[PDB]
Write a protein that binds this ligand. Sequence first.
Ligand SMILES: *[C@@H]1O[C@H](CO)[C@@H](O[C@@H]2O[C@H](CO)[C@@H](O)[C@H](O)[C@H]2NC(C)=O)[C@H](O)[C@H]1NC(C)=O
Ligand SMILES: *[C@@H]1O[C@H](CO)[C@@H](O)[C@H](O)[C@H]1NC(C)=O
Ligand SMILES: *[C@@H]1O[C@H](CO)[C@@H](O)[C@H](O)[C@H]1NC(C)=O
Ligand SMILES: *[C@@H]1O[C@H](CO)[C@@H](O)[C@H](O)[C@H]1NC(C)=O
Ligand SMILES: *[C@@H]1O[C@H](CO)[C@@H](O)[C@H](O)[C@H]1NC(C)=O
Ligand SMILES: *[C@@H]1O[C@H](CO)[C@@H](O)[C@H](O)[C@H]1NC(C)=O
Lengths: 193, 596
Amino acid sequence: NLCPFGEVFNATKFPSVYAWERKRISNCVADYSVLYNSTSFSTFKCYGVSATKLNDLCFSNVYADSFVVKGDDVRQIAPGQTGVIADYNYKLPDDFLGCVLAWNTNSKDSSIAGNYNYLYRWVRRSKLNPYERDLSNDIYSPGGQSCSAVGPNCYNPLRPYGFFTTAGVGHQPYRVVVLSFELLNAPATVCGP
Amino acid sequence: STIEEQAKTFLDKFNHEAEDLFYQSSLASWNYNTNITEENVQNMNNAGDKWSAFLKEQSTLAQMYPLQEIQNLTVKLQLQALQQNGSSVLSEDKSKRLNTILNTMSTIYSTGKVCNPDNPQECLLLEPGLNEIMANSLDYNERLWAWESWRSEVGKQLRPLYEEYVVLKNEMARANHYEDYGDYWRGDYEVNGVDGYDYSRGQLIEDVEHTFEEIKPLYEHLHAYVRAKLMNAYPSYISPIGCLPAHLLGDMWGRFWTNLYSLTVPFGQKPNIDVTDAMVDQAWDAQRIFKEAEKFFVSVGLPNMTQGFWENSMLTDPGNVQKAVCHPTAWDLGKGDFRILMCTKVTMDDFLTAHHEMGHIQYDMAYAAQPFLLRNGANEGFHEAVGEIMSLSAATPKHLKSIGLLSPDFQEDNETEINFLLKQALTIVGTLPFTYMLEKWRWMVFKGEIPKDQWMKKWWEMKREIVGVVEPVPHDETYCDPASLFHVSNDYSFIRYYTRTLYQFQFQEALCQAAKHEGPLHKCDISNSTEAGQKLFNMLRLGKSEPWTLALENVVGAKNMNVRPLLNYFEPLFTWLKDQNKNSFVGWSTDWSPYA
Ligand SMILES: *[C@@H]1O[C@H](CO)[C@@H](O[C@@H]2O[C@H](CO)[C@@H](O)[C@H](O)[C@H]2NC(C)=O)[C@H](O)[C@H]1NC(C)=O
Ligand SMILES: *[C@@H]1O[C@H](CO)[C@@H](O)[C@H](O)[C@H]1NC(C)=O
Ligand SMILES: *[C@@H]1O[C@H](CO)[C@@H](O)[C@H](O)[C@H]1NC(C)=O
Ligand SMILES: *[C@@H]1O[C@H](CO)[C@@H](O)[C@H](O)[C@H]1NC(C)=O
Ligand SMILES: *[C@@H]1O[C@H](CO)[C@@H](O)[C@H](O)[C@H]1NC(C)=O
Ligand SMILES: *[C@@H]1O[C@H](CO)[C@@H](O)[C@H](O)[C@H]1NC(C)=O
């Protein structure tokens, strides 16, 4: 059985970073070679394991998380980083065994007038815990206080990205997939060829 | 819930929104300037209107934040830049009156025309009719007619309006906690709150005067030299003792002395340096010119250009049906978009202008990491200075030979250097007194020292004392001569051109000192010197986030503007002029007038 590499990486639509989707992979033979003649990865970095050793390892459980981020913020998807995305949207633990893949997708996620279909959170009361998701729509009083209208110092937490075709390489969309696998005393699920 | 913490989030919001709308406005403006249609004009006007409205509403909510409870200086700088009240403090009627006055003055300046008697049909505008005769003609009477006709059919209609203008502006200044409008203009150079790097608004005046006191000797000699040559051109019109008539100084107002070069060449048998023919021979295009400029900038350590610059810039005239403006400009649209717009042609002048514009782009590229409000130069003179030092470096014979554009057999003789130095002097040195006198007159009329009835009487007194230029026809009080220039009649400050000139020569000598140059400073090149590039980048990266005194010290090692490098640059011409002026008299007397 082939892997669903053509179903996760060839999807029609990707979710926003604040509402990222996680998928579980069943029994599979990891044949990455069917992905080489179609796309090239601008960022491919693995922590805890060498990328060339995936052919001789079998994982207890595998998860794939998908989202889309700006170009300059791709560096924030790492164990010990700090910043807006790392604190308020997606946080990764320090003891992380997995891989991160990121590729440029300007040709279809950008436009001449601008795409505004991707949102992210810019203010939150406290920093996030690893592997957590928040879907609130409150009004962010900076100092704790109560307000029921969007006016002075009461800001909605979500703001949209700005994607233009003629923008520079730091402001171009990038699609990011995080593959996280565990090694426990359980029967193996995904194995190499 | 400190006010400081509440203001940080507000600034974050403001930056994020300002990026997007500024980008939209810039894109619309580019679409206009590349391609002229009515629809493009409408789109530009819409975008501009939205950006002005957004800025005004943002300023109106910013005043909630008191400035005296903030300790971070970046935050105070941003808030102070955003909290300026503008002209909105005046009542609605007065604001409407002021806008009407400004629009009327701009229109009348831009549409005025004159024509000589007995020819009611053929009337010439300022451009390109009056400029051609002013810059090319050799007849006394035609030049006098043009000068007086332009200053008697356009100035008179400006004298009453300008009057009201002054009063209105003064009131606005006094509602902004300023002494007068001159203080408002001078406030750009003010820095306070940092220990050891402070600058008062009224200090600048003093320094300017001090600097001018050291330029008076050299200029004086140059003045004498020019007079002698002019005595040959107009045998019975110039006194050997007095000043120079105003209608014989190249341009209309006497701002530059460039056009006199043909009449004042030291050695006319030696042709100037010109490389256009070699450019045409080797089949050079615009793309080659810009590639050469990019290589020159790379050689000193600074980065390359991104793919957007090559893909989106318009380096050639579109021609055919399309019409576009051909004034060379460098655009920073934001969000990592940099462009250059110029109608390139194969000539040496375009070769130098490409370097100028690319220096602009490099400076704009250096400080892209600063917040939105701090994405500008330290003051209004750094931007252009950076532009001009590169053009100065790129025109040397060494650099021309290095890129395979001049014959290796070419050997320089001191006559050619003297000619080049005189040509540069007639454009650089001859404009400083004019600028200083104009700004001093404007400052003193705003301050209230000169009463209204004594305006013109002062204007031609200073001209005979500082610049040494006399009037050919007596002028009554009804005239408004200073309003005849573009900058005065369109509300633009005029001191940037002096600090700009001193700063560029301060930078050049400091950069050449780190490249281990040996010899005169007028033959320096900075190619293959990474130390000079690092020293320049240290200043370029800062932006407006620091006081300009620190920015200057990071390059030259001094905290204030200085004039010694200019004299060091022009020393050989100084000694040559001193040698040849042994028979003429140096200086002028005010009492002589052409009609006396
Ligand atoms: C800056 O340095 C480079 C590298 O030394 C120079 O390029 C060489 O120039 C010489 C002649 O000046 C040529 O013979 C070489 O072929 C060039 N390339 C190399 C790799 O040596 C360059 O000329 C220098 N710039 C200036 C203005 O002199
Ligand atoms: C210039 O503007 C006209 C106006 O519609 C447009 O048709 C034309 O395509 C434009 N030129 C370019 C190169 O976009
Ligand atoms: C001012 O705030 C900025 C925000 O990043 C911070 O980097 C800087 O250190 C602050 N200034 C001082 C003096 O702490
Ligand atoms: C002018 O500015 C001061 C302080 O920024 C403010 O108190 C005053 O209300 C402003 N004037 C206007 C436009 O109301
Ligand atoms: C600049 O561009 C050239 C040509 O592509 C390249 O060789 C060089 O590595 C680039 N980097 C710099 C800043 O020199
Ligand atoms: C140039 O140098 C020669 C000697 O090499 C000298 O005789 C001549 O006077 C110099 N030219 C000038 C303008 O001083």
